[PDB]
Amino acid sequence: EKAMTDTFTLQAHDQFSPFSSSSGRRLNISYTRNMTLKDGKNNVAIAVTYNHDGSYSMQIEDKTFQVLGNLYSEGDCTYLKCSVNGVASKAKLIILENTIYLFSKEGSIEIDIPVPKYLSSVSSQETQGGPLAPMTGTIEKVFVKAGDKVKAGDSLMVMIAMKMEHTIKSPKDGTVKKVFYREGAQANRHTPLVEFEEE
Amino acid sequence: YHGDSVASLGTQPDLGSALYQENYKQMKALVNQLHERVEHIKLGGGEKARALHISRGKLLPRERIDNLIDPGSPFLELSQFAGYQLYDNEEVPGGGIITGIGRVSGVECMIIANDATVKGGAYYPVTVKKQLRAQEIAMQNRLPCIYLVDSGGAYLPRQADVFPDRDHFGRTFYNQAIMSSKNIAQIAVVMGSCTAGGAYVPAMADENIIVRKQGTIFLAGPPVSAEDLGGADLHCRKSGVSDHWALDDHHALHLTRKVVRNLNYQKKLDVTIEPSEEPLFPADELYGIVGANLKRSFDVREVIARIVDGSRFTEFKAFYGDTLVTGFARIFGYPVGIVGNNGVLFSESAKKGTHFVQLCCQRNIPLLFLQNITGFMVGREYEAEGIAKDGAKMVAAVACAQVPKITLIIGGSYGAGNYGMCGRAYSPRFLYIWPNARISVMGGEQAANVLATITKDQRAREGKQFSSADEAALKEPIIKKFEEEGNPYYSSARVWDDGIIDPADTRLVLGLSFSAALNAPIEKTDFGIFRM
Amino acid sequence: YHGDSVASLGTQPDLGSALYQENYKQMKALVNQLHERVEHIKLGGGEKARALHISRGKLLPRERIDNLIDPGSPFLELSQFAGYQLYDNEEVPGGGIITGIGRVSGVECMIIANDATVKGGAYYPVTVKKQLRAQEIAMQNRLPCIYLVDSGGAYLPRQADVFPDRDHFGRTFYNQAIMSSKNIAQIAVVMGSCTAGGAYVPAMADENIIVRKQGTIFLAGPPVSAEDLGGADLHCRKSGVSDHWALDDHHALHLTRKVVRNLNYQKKLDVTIEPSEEPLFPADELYGIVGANLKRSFDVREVIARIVDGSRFTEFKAFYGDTLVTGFARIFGYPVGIVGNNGVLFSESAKKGTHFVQLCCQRNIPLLFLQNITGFMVGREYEAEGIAKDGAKMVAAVACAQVPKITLIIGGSYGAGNYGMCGRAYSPRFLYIWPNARISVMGGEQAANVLATITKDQRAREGKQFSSADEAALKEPIIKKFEEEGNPYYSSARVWDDGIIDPADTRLVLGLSFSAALNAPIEKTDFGIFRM
Amino acid sequence: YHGDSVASLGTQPDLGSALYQENYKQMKALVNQLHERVEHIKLGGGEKARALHISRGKLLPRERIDNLIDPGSPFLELSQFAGYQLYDNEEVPGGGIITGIGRVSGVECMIIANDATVKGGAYYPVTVKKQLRAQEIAMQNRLPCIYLVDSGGAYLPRQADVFPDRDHFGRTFYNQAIMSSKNIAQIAVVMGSCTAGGAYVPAMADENIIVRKQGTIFLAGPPVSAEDLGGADLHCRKSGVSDHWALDDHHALHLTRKVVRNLNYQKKLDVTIEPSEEPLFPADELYGIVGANLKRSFDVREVIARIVDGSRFTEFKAFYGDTLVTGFARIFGYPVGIVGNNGVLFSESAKKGTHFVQLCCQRNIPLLFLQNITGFMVGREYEAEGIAKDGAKMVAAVACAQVPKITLIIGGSYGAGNYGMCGRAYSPRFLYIWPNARISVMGGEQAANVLATITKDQRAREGKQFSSADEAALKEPIIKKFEEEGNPYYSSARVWDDGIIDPADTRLVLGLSFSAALNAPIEKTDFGIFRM
Ligand SMILES: CC(C)=CC(=O)SCCNC(=O)CCNC(=O)[C@H](O)C(C)(C)COP(=O)(O)OP(=O)(O)OC[C@@H]1O[C@H](n2cnc3c(N)ncnc32)[C@@H](O)[C@@H]1OP(=O)(O)O
Ligand SMILES: CC(C)=CC(=O)SCCNC(=O)CCNC(=O)[C@H](O)C(C)(C)COP(=O)(O)OP(=O)(O)OC[C@@H]1O[C@H](n2cnc3c(N)ncnc32)[C@@H](O)[C@@H]1OP(=O)(O)O
Ligand SMILES: CC(C)=CC(=O)SCCNC(=O)CCNC(=O)[C@H](O)C(C)(C)COP(=O)(O)OP(=O)(O)OC[C@@H]1O[C@H](n2cnc3c(N)ncnc32)[C@@H](O)[C@@H]1OP(=O)(O)O
Ligand SMILES: O=CCCCC[C@@H]1SC[C@@H]2NC(=O)N[C@@H]21
């Protein structure tokens, strides 16, 4: 976020306004930010306090951590140099989509940034048109006619991709409205294979 | 060639001196008191009210402001102490409203948010005054206004102090309409149930955002169901008052940020700019340098040296009227003309100040006033009649100036000296006071003496006898009243003097204030008759 | 061909009807009460103070004003009831100051004279507010200001309400400097001993006239002899503050008239003019027509017909939104757009008012508002949410208007209706009220019901029981407070609503006000976003 | 912080659906027809005329334009179909003239070149109208005008439609003089023999370039040798009309490029800019989405999502008056306000459009209109009287707007809806239509029904009998005429609706048009009386 602020500041006529700083400073009080991060299936609540000296005091559950660091670039890779409770470490930082990737010689960790509901398309999912081909591959077998009653777990089609057999299975107990592919056809990845009657 | 070496102001204070230690101790105590009081005020309306507000699914006003502004951007809150002990038994933390200046989508905007936890968002007179002051600041600096409307309308008791007069509630709508007409964007976010007074605010706003269920706009409340009379769905679909539909608080804030981006506004500066440099001395030494006793005098040049870029100062007319300090400096790269007090004002000081103000107005340079007016214990009269002829010159020159003006009260401010050094009545863009400041018409002892003399002469003319005990009885209440009314918290409780600021944060506050004030273009200055 | 015959408004009332007799009796009683109170206020500070003032050789302030203005010219005094019972035990007849508009040397000027008999001319907060209002009127209408300075400075007790804030004493000097810069002449006549606050006034004035012996200008009083510290001879000869030397009061007034003559000012009118014609019906019938009971309703068309030239009125949108009356007429040959209330405001009425205001602003025609807002006894809610969407439109249109606006309150004025019909907060050039008017946020009974319902719901949510006796106990104080605060004298004591006027003199007062307001040119009007 | 994530418009269409296939097939057929017709028009006047023109050593007009503009720069030709079947037996490819906007020496300029192969460059009425339209575009956008004059003057037959009236030939010289007076550069390149009408053009131009031998300027032709009467050497040396002497066409174009460089002009933008991003969906899907049948309805949001930067759209008043779509987006980094049609217009839609137009005018944002007015087959009347009161509001707001306006007709445009959505009569900067558009006063069937009803009532009032066969006889011609006149080629043959554009190129055309239109500064907008 601080880097984004600097990028915006670069193009402004006022380049030295104190507002362009990322201090998060307040008058006679300290700013505490409530951040939420998802590790696996667990939501982690982090209370971050912006200190005057430029460091950060982070509280997770009952433990407090003193955090300070900066971003530096080696080649084309951005690196994060940080110190947590006096322990210093370096790691490669990549933020793609809503996932934070941290690469360190100890290991690699992925942290997910929660996506606000409003931004998520509301009513995102209406119906499923059969399992999508696991990959681009030839259709080797079709087990369903144009109108056939199927139950969940009923194999619909068999596909071979790079010499690896996958069997498509019925998602619902709905009768099959139509079939988009026949045997010997090459089906592209994530293309609808079966149409199911609306219920 | 901007290289030329230049002498720097300021000197290293003597830390070992006992006077420095005592002043530092007193200032530290004052600052700690201020910080703890601000913390308690920030706590909010109360525990039960906060619990109910959270249970209704809404966000606390400070959380709303934090989510609205850009990540990590500083927030300049205004008048945090409004309503502090203003009313005898009712507690109004922060005046019931929150106002400040922050950056939204890279644009500096004025934010006004009602605190629903304080008397259900009802408007006390101090709340109306605070909102009017914020609106006036935004209009003067051409800052977009964002309203987070959650209020119960005017406080039914004390209606006489809120409804009728010119500076009462209707001035809010008047200012809204005027600023809308002047191309200053108005955005209203109905984050909770409004009322008759609250309802008009979204109507006059250019853009409205109303939450699906919490938001309810009715010109008159039920006292028909609240949702049916006024609701997000109804206003969005049938009445058409609402302009955007928001699922909850976070969605409303996101929509507000988007609406600001599409404002199509670019900030442009008229004054020249230079790279910013930090002062050469630590700011915390101001505690020892200034202390808490107004009787002692300190050189304002130290304060100037600890708050200007690189501690570089170009004094103007140094040896003429030395009780007044004037010169040119730069704060965060903006040019500024500093006018400070170093003692009693004289004719030479007034003339020098008038000359400097004329120069600054001609060159279109912002002005900064540092007020430390002195008590009359040292000089009873000093033929003050001479001062009157020349004090006015400064008063007029200051009033007619059109450049951005910011006043900071670092010490006493009494008598016509307050008017001369850009008092609150002369419309500075911002006004701040340090925790040790004192403001009043005159010192209490001086006032008591004046009253006693008047009574004795009248009694003598009547032939009645003025008893010595009677004189003492008259003097004691006056001294107590003046001391009480001169407290910085007394002045901050009323919307005078905006808010109190820690001296260590003076440079940051001034930088933020000047950056905000530079949004508006600088107009030409027209002066009245100079009684040369 | 301006000959065309035109129908005339108004009808002959039934004098024999008992309702007319009762209304006439009530209005006559109210007017007699007002006249006697005004007489007592005109008496002055007191007998002993007046005797001392005359013994010092000075003229009484009303005598000064009478001698200053042109012979026989009418004088329009403003806020005669300021300070009426405002303070618990101190009597301040007229607020301690006298303000009005009169003709000096054929030029309309605003006159501000201190009454030295009231607390030696000390400035109460109400005095400062009255002077600020007069200065604002003069600045808006571009009228020269004449000050008859005889004051003892700010009242030392109650200093907090007079010194510090923006609308406090310093705003006087600020307005003086601004108006001087805008070519609005400032003339100060030091007719008596001033003080620190009083001294600055002559200094900032363009021209000064100081009496030989009574006049004494000192930046600080003796509490050295008064004459030596500040005197006519000293200021004229050595200090040079004085611009003219006057032997006594009459000579000072003559010099002031001469100074006003050499102003080199000529009044020019922008609006068209027509020969003036008297109304077709007597004005005293308004007593019977209006009465003193706000519950009964009267047709505003009668009031319009009794105050317009020839009783000629051109109604606009007569059958649409009939609760609001709008049209064109002429008072003393000046065009005017009349906007009156005939009932509860609805969406159609708001739209019609917005359309009429737009037309008047486009054609550069002065606007006149007659407010008679109705209580909610008839309609509890009436889906007021619809009104909110359209009421705002009228509120914005009224605020953004730049034409001269004059508001007269002939009846009740409550809620947002006050804001819609050019309330005091929207800066009308003048505001007047009849003796039977009532102003407040809402009717007392309605307010009490609202408070009781809120408490019952909160108590129920808490699970505590709201006793019926408790509800009655809460309601009785609220009803009493609202009734007391709604009195016309309560509003006039504060500087709101300028002064009360006899209904028989409404035409003359409006003519004088419009003639004064026409001095300034009419600027273009810029409107904000119309939330069509 | 501009890094906030924002939802994107648009959805992936179903390619397998038969409706998509049919719509794609129809649109592809229409586009292929348009492309082949444009190719034939580009062929030129004829083979023999082209051979003679080349034999005389001159360059073909399209070659001239190609050599004039900067290398590789796109060229925006205007009204390619002017004169298409306009006259019964005479073929006028392109109207006999070529107009467009291109970049010369880094400056956007309007280029007008006569095609000498078409009737020896004689001016048909359509040619005059096209040239006048190009000149008006250049004047509105403050673009320099370059004339490649090679014409034989006015077409002697049909003189009545070219010489006399206001919008006839003399308006060309009038516009030239006005634009020269307004500092818009005029450059005339006499590339061939002109005539009496042609001669005046170089005379009024600020700078002239005449070819040595082909160029001949005579106020009246020989019908003395042509060179002696008017020639490059004579005009350069003795008469002095010529300003530059060119050996041939290439030299003349090089001199023209140099002359433009020497203009001392710099383009400056008022609106804010952001980095450009491509839309998230392919443009060719518009063929399937829209199709060629006007009876079916498609969501305009798809069209918006396929032509805006990043498919980012901020809808305004989404749920109020949903038949009209309004919001903010950016095309090639420029801000734009999009106003599209999604169904029949209602009162709510008109009010929403008026509000959006007011907002855009206040913020100085260019407006883009997408018109798809609906037939009245669905609703016979729907109490259209309500629509009249509110339709006007949109019509006025649109007319009074001063921001750059661009109208694109993607479907039907009938009745007052054409006027409301910035029709050709309301002076949009540019107007374009897709190949499937239809424009007329009303649908043919509706018009026939109206005429039949009027005749039946009149015949009945007369007592004459209206035979059923008679009604059918009246209806059939009207239906045929309306269908014929509504063709896009019919409207493009006349200079209405500039030119037809392939839907796949809509984004590029809009970007070029807005870039050209941003040359002129954006003035303030003044609105008339809003009926409210
Ligand atoms: C502009 C013009 C021209 C005119 C107008 O504007 S005329 C406006 C008339 N106002 C209303 O019509 C709103 C009536 N409120 C309500 O409908 C609700 O109350 C809400 C909406 C306020 C939400 O509040 P809530 O209901 O969620 O909680 P509550 O605890 O009940 O909230 C605190 C409790 O309100 C009491 N309280 C005291 N004074 C007021 C007051 N002035 N307004 C509201 N409440 C007040 C407080 O004393 C008690 O708490 P306390 O002091 O006993 O501890
Ligand atoms: C602007 C800024 C920035 C600062 C300032 O301005 S700081 C100004 C300081 N003021 C002075 O320095 C003037 C001190 N007066 C005097 O020098 C004189 O008095 C005169 C000049 C007033 C003439 O008056 P006088 O002397 O001819 O008659 P007197 O009856 O004595 O007049 C009434 C008596 O004055 C008492 N009284 C109460 N309050 C005041 C008051 N505020 N000022 C004066 N007098 C007051 C009153 O209570 C008693 O009568 P009462 O109430 O007992 O019946
Ligand atoms: C502004 C005001 C206020 C007044 C005026 O402007 S009053 C202007 C009077 N015009 C002239 O004085 C120019 C007379 N032309 C000539 O002197 C030449 O012709 C040139 C210069 C045109 C070059 O042309 P060219 O001579 O090289 O070739 P040509 O094939 O001959 O060119 C096509 C042939 O011109 C015939 N033709 C029909 N109509 C016209 C027409 N209006 N003008 C010219 N030619 C026309 C066309 O019908 C035939 O071909 P077609 O139709 O038979 O196939
Ligand atoms: O076809 C690609 C290589 C791997 C599969 C080939 C199979 S393995 C069993 C059988 N025996 C062969 O030699 N080839 C096929």
PDB file of N, CA and C in Angstrom, chain B residues 202-217:
ATOM      1  N   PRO B 202     -29.117  14.239   2.798  1.00  0.00           N
ATOM      2  CA  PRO B 202     -28.982  13.454   1.561  1.00  0.00           C
ATOM      3  C   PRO B 202     -29.689  14.075   0.375  1.00  0.00           C
ATOM      4  N   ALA B 203     -30.819  14.750   0.598  1.00  0.00           N
ATOM      5  CA  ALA B 203     -31.548  15.352  -0.510  1.00  0.00           C
ATOM      6  C   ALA B 203     -30.722  16.431  -1.195  1.00  0.00           C
ATOM      7  N   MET B 204     -30.022  17.253  -0.413  1.00  0.00           N
ATOM      8  CA  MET B 204     -29.231  18.335  -0.980  1.00  0.00           C
ATOM      9  C   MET B 204     -27.883  17.869  -1.511  1.00  0.00           C
ATOM     10  N   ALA B 205     -27.437  16.675  -1.137  1.00  0.00           N
ATOM     11  CA  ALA B 205     -26.160  16.172  -1.616  1.00  0.00           C
ATOM     12  C   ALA B 205     -26.240  15.815  -3.095  1.00  0.00           C
ATOM     13  N   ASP B 206     -25.121  16.014  -3.795  1.00  0.00           N
ATOM     14  CA  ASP B 206     -25.064  15.661  -5.208  1.00  0.00           C
ATOM     15  C   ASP B 206     -25.215  14.159  -5.410  1.00  0.00           C
ATOM     16  N   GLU B 207     -24.553  13.362  -4.575  1.00  0.00           N
ATOM     17  CA  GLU B 207     -24.604  11.911  -4.666  1.00  0.00           C
ATOM     18  C   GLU B 207     -24.951  11.330  -3.304  1.00  0.00           C
ATOM     19  N   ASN B 208     -25.824  10.328  -3.300  1.00  0.00           N
ATOM     20  CA  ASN B 208     -26.263   9.671  -2.078  1.00  0.00           C
ATOM     21  C   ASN B 208     -25.900   8.196  -2.123  1.00  0.00           C
ATOM     22  N   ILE B 209     -25.532   7.656  -0.966  1.00  0.00           N
ATOM     23  CA  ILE B 209     -25.334   6.224  -0.784  1.00  0.00           C
ATOM     24  C   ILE B 209     -26.061   5.821   0.488  1.00  0.00           C
ATOM     25  N   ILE B 210     -26.976   4.864   0.372  1.00  0.00           N
ATOM     26  CA  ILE B 210     -27.833   4.462   1.479  1.00  0.00           C
ATOM     27  C   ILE B 210     -27.687   2.963   1.689  1.00  0.00           C
ATOM     28  N   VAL B 211     -27.499   2.557   2.946  1.00  0.00           N
ATOM     29  CA  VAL B 211     -27.358   1.142   3.261  1.00  0.00           C
ATOM     30  C   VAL B 211     -28.717   0.459   3.177  1.00  0.00           C
ATOM     31  N   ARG B 212     -28.713  -0.807   2.750  1.00  0.00           N
ATOM     32  CA  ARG B 212     -29.950  -1.588   2.471  1.00  0.00           C
ATOM     33  C   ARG B 212     -30.956  -1.596   3.610  1.00  0.00           C
ATOM     34  N   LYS B 213     -30.509  -1.871   4.819  1.00  0.00           N
ATOM     35  CA  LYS B 213     -31.443  -2.036   5.929  1.00  0.00           C
ATOM     36  C   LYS B 213     -31.258  -1.011   7.032  1.00  0.00           C
ATOM     37  N   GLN B 214     -30.019  -0.739   7.443  1.00  0.00           N
ATOM     38  CA  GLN B 214     -29.792   0.272   8.468  1.00  0.00           C
ATOM     39  C   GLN B 214     -30.199   1.655   7.977  1.00  0.00           C
ATOM     40  N   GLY B 215     -29.871   1.978   6.731  1.00  0.00           N
ATOM     41  CA  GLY B 215     -30.206   3.286   6.194  1.00  0.00           C
ATOM     42  C   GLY B 215     -31.707   3.452   6.056  1.00  0.00           C
ATOM     43  N   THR B 216     -32.231   4.543   6.612  1.00  0.00           N
ATOM     44  CA  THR B 216     -33.650   4.866   6.517  1.00  0.00           C
ATOM     45  C   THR B 216     -33.789   6.377   6.453  1.00  0.00           C
ATOM     46  N   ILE B 217     -34.316   6.878   5.339  1.00  0.00           N
ATOM     47  CA  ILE B 217     -34.517   8.310   5.168  1.00  0.00           C
ATOM     48  C   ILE B 217     -36.010   8.603   5.228  1.00  0.00           C
TER      49      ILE B 217
END
